[PDB]
Design a protein around this ligand. Structure first.
Ligand SMILES: [Zn+2]
Ligand SMILES: [Zn+2]
Length: 825
């Protein structure tokens, strides 16, 4: 039994070196790992070439189901284990088994011996030789003798640590058993006071991690760039001490300090650190001191994860949740008869090389990322509750030959069982299992993770679609009306009129929803209760809300007013719009209260416009007179300037016209008091010299839309679709739940990817006949056999407008790489 610190493959093929903790101190020993690959060679009879020394066997493993691979054909799969040295020597010639006729690909050729050893063998290494000296003077061979023991406790750790840090010339070093700090080219006093301050502020953490790392140290602020080599050598002969690395140039530091390859090291890369251009000393001091005093908690968490997941310390990292998923899932498949499709240094599933080719169905499943939603505008007098839906993907996964696009059923079942056992373990107070459950969805979406298949992602998305529509149907089974739908928010119209009466109703409804077997794992929370709502859009609504219904007391009612349409008004009319919106909301509240006091038309709201008709008309007349008087004055030209915003496309002249048009369209949403609104609108339009059904008196959307789907937040794992045009500022740059700023070059890259996928989709479109909508089925042909000329499924003007709005968006904010992307066209 031995605890492995690190695995590492040698330059010679099939040879690996390990820093292991021998019964005394650490020790290094050499191994030999053969390779294992899977072929599809010939149909039933093959040129075996048995004279070559290797192991061959016709297996019956489960191959991945590619959409393009529709013909099973010959299925005599072969399992070949083979040392990599002879593989490299036989790669030279062509007359060999690897390259012949009827060779259909290699399925497990990109798996290093390091990976095979760390998945099958693990850190808990032991021997059962029962020639140990002869096996340690040379590399101990493992394929004949290998096994993994239990790993409940990895090791009782009591041994020194190292520390080398960099902040873009801020190379820093520290020793646990040292007593000095020197920094490469007021500071000392600030350093001492800050260290003492965070000492008392983290006394408890320091005490509870002192057994890992333990004190004032000498400070120094140091032709000087060669001292890294000297310090590394000095620490090499001073101790045998794990190294902690923190810099954006880890590979550069490893390649420029030759001594760093001689000891096991643990990397803690948290890059993207920048300088404030002024007073960088306090912030850098804070960074270094918090890193120094949090390394103990870091190593505690790392040893927890390692001794939980049977992974060596040096091969772990704080944010490598996907790696553990890959390791566990891969070993669970290895004990199974399923080929791993393992991939390295490429975000594509391994399929034998077929995956390099371009195929239409793969292209369409790659770019199918948009998610639908439900919006039913109108004015509601019934109470409406706002709920949130959580843990949707996990419940969707856990709940539930002919089709070539289907994902493999066996892998789906295995993943469901693994997720179920993780859920059960996390229920029994396991933080690691909880973190794994939280990170599962991010692992699924992220292509950078290995064992990633777009087919599986599409399968999950399709299942989520079906589950959401089923949930909507279930909510519709009882008395309910869905106002808005999304992956995160659902608004439901309640039959009753008083919020106080919906307490037991809402609780019973949510209880019944939870008790449903397919909705067992969902998490439902109620946020707000609505008294009177004017809902037309996600970004444009106003109403009266109470947070939560209390007992024996009248609830607190607050008014909300979110209207992007207000921004597109003239600067001088926005106060008028606000005031009149407030007045009309007050009138509707008053008439609903009066009707309720009395006891597809509803007398709750009918007759509400009689309260404010004449003052509104007089005010509109006064506004028209003043605008007529002072429109051509130069000093008054400032307040009549129509603002320009991203996504604006309408070109119009008279501001009062849009003011009244919006003020009438907001009222027209009644869907039950149409005639009164129409009479009022005609009377308003009579003030101008216009007519009831004129084109210029028609309201439109004063903005376009540009939505980015499946936007992810690293800190909170929140998934939402962000709109680059309709959304207000100071929300594009920060996550909704957690108030953490977003990275900007990520936004630019995502916009560029969306644009390029759009262009590709336009360029790969199909052709449809004009008269009969049948599709083109021939490569060369002038027209349909019937009458009619071909037209494209994707019209040109649509993509032209899309590019226009990309241009406007990129111009509004600072987006330079996107501008360069435009320029290359
Ligand atoms: Zn977030
Ligand atoms: Zn036709």
């Amino acid at each position: 039994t031995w605890e492995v610190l690190q695995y590492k493959d040698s330059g010679e093929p099939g040879v690996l070196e390990v820093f292991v903790t021998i019964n005394g101190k650490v020790q290094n020993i050499t191994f030999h790992i053969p390779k294992t690959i899977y072929m599809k060679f010939k149909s039933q009879t093959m040129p075996l070439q048995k004279i070559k020394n290797c192991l061959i066997e016709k297996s019956s493993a489960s191959l991945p189901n590619n959409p393009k691979t529709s013909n099973p054909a010959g299925g005599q799969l072969f399992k070949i284990t083979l040392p990599e040295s002879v593989f490299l020597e036989e790669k030279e010639n062509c007359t060999s088994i690897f390259n012949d006729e009827n060779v259909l690909g290699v399925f497990e050729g990109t798996i290093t011996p390091h990976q095979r050893a760390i998945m099958d063998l693990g850190a808990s290494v032991t021997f059962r030789s029962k020639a140990l000296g002869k096996g340690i003077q040379q590399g101990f061979e493992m394929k004949d003798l290998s096994m993994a023991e239990n790993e409940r406790y990895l090791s009782g750790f009591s041994m020194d640590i190292g520390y080398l840090l960099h902040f873009p010339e801020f190379f820093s070093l520290f020793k646990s058993w040292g007593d000095t700090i020197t920094i490469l080219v007021i500071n000392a006093s600030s350093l001492g006071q800050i260290y003492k301050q965070m000492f008392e502020k983290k006394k408890g953490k320091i005490e509870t991690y002192s057994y890992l790392v333990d004190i004032n140290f000498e400070f120094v602020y140091f032709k000087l760039y060669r001292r890294l080599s000297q310090e590394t050598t000095k620490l090499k002969e001073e101790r045998g001490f794990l190294l902690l690395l923190q810099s954006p140039f880890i590979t550069k530091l490893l390649g420029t300090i030759r001594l760093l390859n001689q000891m096991p090291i643990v990397k803690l890369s948290l890059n993207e650190v920048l300088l404030p251009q002024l007073n960088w000393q306090p912030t850098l001091l804070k960074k270094l001191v918090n890193h120094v005093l949090s390394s103990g908690s870091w190593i505690s968490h790392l040893i927890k994860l390692s001794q939980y997941s049977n992974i060596p310390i040096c091969n772990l990292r704080l944010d490598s949740m996907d790696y553990i998923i890959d390791v566990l899932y891969a070993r669970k498949l290895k004990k199974e008869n399923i080929v791993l499709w393992w991939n390295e240094k490429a975000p594509l599933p391994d399929h034998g090389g077929i995956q390099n080719d371009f195929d239409l169905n793969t292209s369409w499943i790659m770019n199918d990322s948009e998610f639908p939603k439900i919006n039913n505008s109108g004015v509601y007098d019934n109470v409406v509750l706002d709920v949130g839906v959580d843990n949707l993907t996990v419940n969707t996964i856990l709940t539930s030959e002919f089709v070539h696009d289907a994902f493999s059923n066996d892998a789906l079942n295995v993943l469901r069982g693994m997720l179920k056992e993780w859920w059960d373990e996390a229920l029994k107070e396991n933080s690691t299992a909880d973190l794994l459950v939280n990170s599962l969805a991010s692992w699924v979406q992220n292509p950078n993770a290995k064992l990633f298949d777009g087919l599986l992602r599409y399968h999950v998305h399709n299942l989520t679609k079906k589950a959401l529509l089923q949930l909507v149907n279930e909510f519709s089974a009882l008395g309910s009306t869905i106002v808005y739908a999304d992956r995160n928010q659902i608004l439901i119209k309640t039959n009753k009129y008083s919020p106080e009466n919906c307490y037991a109703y809402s609780q019973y409804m949510m209880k019944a929803v939870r008790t449903n077997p397919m909705f067992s794992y969902l998490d439902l929370n109620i946020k707000r209760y609505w008294d009177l709502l004017i809902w037309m859009d996600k970004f444009n609504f106003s109403g009266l809300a109470c947070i939560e219904i209390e007992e024996k007391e009248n609830q607190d009612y607050t008014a909300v007013s979110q209207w992007q349409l207000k921004k597109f008004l003239s600067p001088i009319y926005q106060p008028e719009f606000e005031d009149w919106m407030m007045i009309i909301l007050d009138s509707m509240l008053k008439t609903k209260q009066s009707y309720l006091k009395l006891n597809s038309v509803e007398n709750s709201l009918n007759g509400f416009s009689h309260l404010f008709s004449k003052p509104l008309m007089k005010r509109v007349k006064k506004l028209f007179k003043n605008q007529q008087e002072f429109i051509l004055d130069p000093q008054y030209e400032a307040d009549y300037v129509i603002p320009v915003l991203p996504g604006s496309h309408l070109n119009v002249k008279n501001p009062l016209l849009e003011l009244v048009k919006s003020l009438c369209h907001v009222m027209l949403l009644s869907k039950s008091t149409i005639l009164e609104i129409r009479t009022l609108r005609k009377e308003l339009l009579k003030i101008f010299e216009l007519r009831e059904f004129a084109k210029v008196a028609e309201f439109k959307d004063p903005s376009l839309s540009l939505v980015v789907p499946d936007f992810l937040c690293e800190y909170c794992f929140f998934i939402s679709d962000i709109d680059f045009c309709k959304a207000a500022p100071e929300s594009i740059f920060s996550c909704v739940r957690c108030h953490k700023a977003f990275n900007q070059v990520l936004l630019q890259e995502h916009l560029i990817q969306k644009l390029r996928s759009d262009i590709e989709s336009y360029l790969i479109q199909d052709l449809r006949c004009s008269r009969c909508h049948k599709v083109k089925r021939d490569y060369m042909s002038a027209h349909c056999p019937c009458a009619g000329a071909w037209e494209g499924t994707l019209p040109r003007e649509s993509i032209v407008q899309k590019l226009n709005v990309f241009k406007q968006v990129a111009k509004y904010y600072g987006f330079d790489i996107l501008l360069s992307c435009i320029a290359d066209l």
